[PDB]
Ligand SMILES: NC(=O)c1ccc[n+]([C@@H]2O[C@H](COP(=O)([O-])OP(=O)(O)OC[C@H]3O[C@@H](n4cnc5c(N)ncnc54)[C@H](O)[C@@H]3O)[C@@H](O)[C@H]2O)c1
Ligand SMILES: NC(=O)c1ccc[n+]([C@@H]2O[C@H](COP(=O)([O-])OP(=O)(O)OC[C@H]3O[C@@H](n4cnc5c(N)ncnc54)[C@H](O)[C@@H]3O)[C@@H](O)[C@H]2O)c1
């Protein structure tokens with residue numbers, strides 16, 4: 001009837017090809033630009049924040065969560081990221097803590113049209129979001145980045161931030177000695193000099209900090225409440241379980257705090273520690289009217305990052321566009337579309353080879 | 356390492372390898388056993404499902420349906436209800452897929468079609484309820500709505516009851532016209548008949564319509580047989596019902612998922628205290644249904660992810676039997692877990 005629909009699958013080999021072909025820096029800039037425009041759209045009321053996401057707490061081996069994150073563009077498509085936070089992963093299985101995929105469904109028919117790896121895309125859009133926030137809230141001559149947690153997100157935090165700020169040094173800490181010791185290797189491609197530094201030194205020297213740890217519920221802060229530079233900006237990225245926090249309450253209460261997604265942040269971000277009156281205007285507001293950020297670069301600021309599906313949808317479109325140009329991915333007929341729409345058993349087998 | 360994907364050609368090859376009747380029976384058996392586990396408190400009903408409403412071209416909804424087995428895997432069905440699909444697009448109303456993820460690590464280990472699977476487990480669920488609640492000598496099936504679910508309703512029921520004929524109705528003439536062809540494989544003779552006649556003559560009815568919210572009922576309260584059992588299958592949007600209230604109030608009603616049915620099924624029209632035991636309890640203790648076969652009964656079917664997990668497991672086993680499917684490395688598992696740009700050869 002209509003032309004046969006199939007699901008366009010970009011797995012790990014194609015996603016690697018997009019990175020090699022576009023270039024890491026260009027790909028990240030594309031994501032930054034698309035996020036910036038989309039957040040400003042939300043800030044103008046032209047689009048909406050994603051609905052709250054849902055999830056299943058897992059107790060074992062270590063407390064974790066598996067979430068589904070929908071975003072609908074009415075009449076167009078529905079994006080659904082499915083993603084696990086499993087922080088025993090790298091230590092028990094050799095896997096990323098964050099493992100997921102992103103799928104797109106036609107909003108008109110419901111058909112699954114595309115499916116791709118969520119691991120790299122997640123890391124990219126999360127670094128991008130910190131870059132968006134830091135352009136607005138970090139001093140534009142920031143030279144020193146601090147990183148607490150030097151696992152996966154840390155790599156793209158450094159990368160994104162190195163594209164928007166004149167970073168000269170990264171001072172880095174992880175409670176796992178092997179993970180902080182390998183960071184420099186992982187960070188080499190950015191050109192930014194790396195030094196292992198304890199949290200107190202990070203707090204004392206950084207212009208900009210990103211916290212992105214797997215700290216357990218009840219076990220923060222990961223950055224001690226000591227001396228910070230007056231203009232410090234922090235991207236508080238770590239987040240999973242209710243009860244999981246990274247920053248000291250005291251520090252938050254001296255900061256201009258902006259959430260990506262306030263309803264979410266107030267339940268599972270750093271803002272879970274705060275009453276709502278202690279939040280400034282949300283990131284989308286700042287994107288749409290950057291004058292709202294006036295004077296905030298020069299005093300303490302916190303971006304409370306939690307992640308939401310709109311970010312995944314935008315990043316996925318960047319990937320799909322680049323994959324379309326470069327002829328990447330496979331086409332798989334996953335859904336059964338019977339030749340008679342009213343007959344579940346109108347099934348077509350694999351054609352016979354020509355003998 | 357990789358994701359095992361079973362597509363449209365592979366599910367065709369499953370049905371051929373197993374046989375339509377046998378595959379249905381396999382699903383009926385797994386569902387019976389699984390429901391009984393729930394009825395004994397050994398497994399739990401899936402959590403309430405989520406959804407996004409869609410207004411164009413006609414009202415529908417797209418839903419996500421999770422089921423966790425703590426420690427093995429998480430099943431997620433993603434499924435649309437888009438009742439203009441057949442007439443506008445030549446696509447099924449119900450269009451979905453079912454994915455399996457490892458509970459421990461979160462990885463995506465399998466992905467398959469949800470269209471056949473949904474039709475089969477939904478037929479199966481009615482067969483489960485009907486074996487308990489229809490007269491065992493039922494010979495006449497009634498169908499209101501003769502779209503895709505009606506096919507597997509007839510099929511599954513034909514396997515647990517000695518059906519000789521089906522009396523059928525659809526508000527779309529072209530859809531009631533084609534039913535006999537879609538049903539012919541079962542050997543059950545088909546006759547088109549108005550809803551009042553189906554109500555008077557059927558031993559067992561399944562309602563599975565894409566009726567709009569507030570436009571029920573699809574079966575009139577016009578006189579029924581004493582022993583009638585109804586599988587009330589249709590549902591999607593809150594405010595959608597198929598049965599007349601007067602009939603529900605006189606019935607022994609069992610729900611697949613009571614909490615869900617009270618919100619989205621026929622049990623929307625009832626209070627919790629009026630329901631009989633849930634279907635899981637009846638499967639755990641069939642003796643609890645004694646005598647209900649001979650009086651008016653309704654199974655309020657809404658669909659829940661546990662049924663999809665169980666059906667998916669049947670497909671996976673059959674496909675493993677025959678090395679069916681492809682394996683695709685979708686997820687980027689960097690050898691270096693801490694490097695999202697560690698991609699990936701050689
Ligand atoms: N958009 C978002 O805001 C977003 C997106 C992706 C991930 N995340 C979250 O960011 C966090 C990090 O993810 P990841 O992929 O980098 O995980 P990872 O497991 O790759 O890295 C986490 C690092 O934190 C270290 N760590 C644990 N406790 C610490 C402490 N007290 N101080 C310093 N280091 C500590 C671990 O040793 C590990 O190396 C998680 O909480 C995750 O859910 C958020
Ligand atoms: N487990 C469950 O209970 C479960 C599972 C799958 C589908 N469903 C539901 O079953 C319903 C049918 O799904 P389908 O896949 O067969 O859809 P379909 O579109 O193939 O068939 C529905 C049929 O209903 C007919 N119809 C509409 N209004 C009617 C009326 N007032 N009287 C008689 N016929 C009418 C249509 O003309 C169409 O032929 C949907 O609501 C769907 O969401 C339930």
Ligand SMILES: O=C(O)[C@@H]1CCCCN1
Pocket residue numbers: 067083084085098122239240306307308
């Ligand atoms: O938005 C994200 O992708 C992450 C997934 C893990 C939990 C928190 N946020």
Ligand SMILES: O=C(O)[C@@H]1CCCCN1
Pocket residue numbers: 418434435436449473590591657658659
């Ligand atoms: O359980 C199911 O698959 C169907 C999906 C559509 C809404 C009604 N229930």
